[PDB]
Amino acid sequence: NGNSLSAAELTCGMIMCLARQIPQATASMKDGKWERKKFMGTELNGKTLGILGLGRIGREVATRMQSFGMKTIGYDPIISPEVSASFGVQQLPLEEIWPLCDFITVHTPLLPSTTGLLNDNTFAQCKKGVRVVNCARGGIVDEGALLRALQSGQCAGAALDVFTEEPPRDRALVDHENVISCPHLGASTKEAQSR
Amino acid sequence: NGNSLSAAELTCGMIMCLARQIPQATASMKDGKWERKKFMGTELNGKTLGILGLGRIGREVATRMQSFGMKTIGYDPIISPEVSASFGVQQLPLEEIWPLCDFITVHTPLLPSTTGLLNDNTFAQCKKGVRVVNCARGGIVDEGALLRALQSGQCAGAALDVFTEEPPRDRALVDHENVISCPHLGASTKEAQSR
Ligand SMILES: Cn1nc(-c2ccccc2)cc1N
Ligand SMILES: Cn1nc(-c2ccccc2)cc1N
């Protein structure tokens, strides 16, 4: 609410980090390396962004990423297609979303219906090389399925602010070279903190 | 030109990384740590971004950052104030720019008039804690003065894609905890690469 923008901003930061590998590049530079070929990245302009959850945060991510020329599609069981259309997000059924996306971000509560929203079965329906962001709640993305998808290349990268357990006891995702992460920083701004 | 968007995207990446310390945070996570308090960040909405150089890349950065609610001001010796106004950048003389900015980004060629455009003198005229980006040409920002500004806290952070020497032989900037960096990745996208 106060914190809608802090979360939305982080999410968009994570999207740009996935496209360009800024965290990995910084660590390479700090280790004395100059690795130009390794961190060849991708332009966001023209790419499809799937937004799952079209409440305040989802809407704010949408309008920021639209300024980059991203095509913004999404799903929400509750928000009307008229409302989402008013902020430029084309709503489609989930099964239609998966194959279209270059990026996917999640902006849902953690409910039975949203736990492992992204799992083995939904990763299989994505475009190969999809990139995924979870700055919402840990568990929305099944962590085992994400690791399997990163191992195969089915997922090319992921940005995680939240984890099923916090801090995560299993370090395989954090340790993966194509994973960027923060210690649940989504509301951690000076501004969000004072209403 | 092809590559205007690749550069502009990287610059906006670096702005978001400075606000939220995403590269540092990822390193912290990869080192096994969960340091939430340490990486308290800042919201971009409502902040002032100064854009020095209002050509194609500067413009594109402007319109993207404007979607985050940033106030975009700037300076260019060639572009008229009515023209910059038409893409939402308020032009002011340089001396007026320094004290207003929360973030500064440079988008100039490397000329005598732009080498060390940011130096000891212009850092002193900035707001304490200014954050700086150079995704343009190495040397626009005086590297020595930038280090001194980071050491004093006058500059709270910097993001560098380019260096006076590449790879940089002097490692003090790169190694600083508030500096994020890439190995000259501004045009390093699959898309920019094929015209
Ligand atoms: C109850 N509920 N469910 C969602 C949802 C679930 C799956 C995908 C997108 C959105 C959002 C809310 N508030
Ligand atoms: C020739 N020139 N000079 C600049 C400049 C100079 C000082 C400050 C900001 C921008 C940009 C271009 N194209």
Residue numbers in the entry:
A (entry chain B), B (entry chain A): 100 to 294
Reported in the publication:
PHGDH-93 was then successfully crystallised with an empty, accessible cofactor-binding pocket. Soaking of all 15 fragments into PHGDH-93 crystals was performed overnight at RT using a fragment concentration of 80 mM in 20 % DMSO. Difference electron density corresponding to seven fragments (3, 5, 9, 10, 14-16, 47 % of tested compounds) was clearly visible. All of the fragments for which crystallographic data were obtained bound to the adenine-pocket suggesting this pocket to be a preferential site for fragment binding. Analysis of the fragments’ binding modes showed that four of the fragments (5, 14, 15 and 16) were coordinated by hydrogen and/or halogen bonds, whereas the other three fragments (3, 9 and 10) appeared to be stabilised only by apolar contacts. The remaining two crystallographically observed fragments, 3 (1-methyl-3-phenyl-1H-pyrazol-5-amine) and 10 (3-(1,3-oxazol-5-yl)aniline) were non-fused bicyclic aromatic systems, which, although not forming specific hydrogen bonds to the protein, bound in a similar orientation to one another to the adenine pocket (3, Kd = 5.8 ± 2.0 mM and 10, Kd = 9.3 ± 3.8 mM).
